[PDB]
Design a binder for these strands. Structure first.
Lengths: 109, 109
DNA sequence: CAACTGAGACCGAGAAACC
DNA sequence: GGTTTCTCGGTCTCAGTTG
């Protein structure tokens, strides 16, 4: 669908703190991934990306759909793991840190 | 695909767990031993065999590789029992606060 | 100070809905 | 067919509470 182009556009936009690359080829990038109870959680800051994917696919209409960051992140994560265009480098992801992040590589084809 | 129901029924019909017995012939209500770990009368091996068996069934524990954790096993089994739609708790009949405390659970068709 | 608890959050793996 | 999403049956995390 649009996941590949949408995600690379969102990383290139820079409007999401933590959504950055790792090299110049832009084949490997980071993505913020916080739990919803770690205290340092800002609802409108960390869920923004997961909100955009709900707005881009019509899964969430402002004013006509009650907010739900859980299912937003659920949808985006399921589509990201099941996509054959992204491979999560499990060893390079950093989970037990301050403001965690996950490392992905886009496979070209 | 839900192994909790059949596994619990097998562990009850086997009878190798003292206290894990039925209370009726329809096999729809049963007793489960629920002792606190802080008590001196808490035998760490026998009073936690079922939670350890649940950890071993779902591959959560491997003897000789991981460190034993009876509290986490108890927490896991309790969360599975509360979240599952099959077993429901009869708190009014649980009859805790006896030398051999227990919980009474009911099976739902 | 461990052990325990419920409630909300999370997750991977089919089974669908969908382009 | 390829792609995103919905189900589902557990598990995880946290702020409390209890022994």
């Amino acid at each position: 669908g649009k996941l590949r182009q949408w995600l690379i556009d969102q990383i290139d936009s820079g409007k999401y703190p933590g959504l950055v690359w790792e090299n110049e080829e832009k084949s490997i990038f980071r993505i913020p991934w916080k739990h919803a109870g770690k205290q340092d959680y800002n609802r409108e800051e960390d869920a923004a990306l997961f909100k955009a994917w709900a707005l881009f696919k019509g899964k969430f209409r402002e004013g006509i759909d009650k907010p739900d960051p859980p299912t937003w992140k659920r949808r985006l994560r399921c589509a990201l793991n099941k996509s054959n265009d992204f491979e999560e480098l499990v060893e390079r992801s950093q989970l037990d840190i301050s403001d965690p992040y996950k490392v992905y590589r886009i496979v070209p084809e």
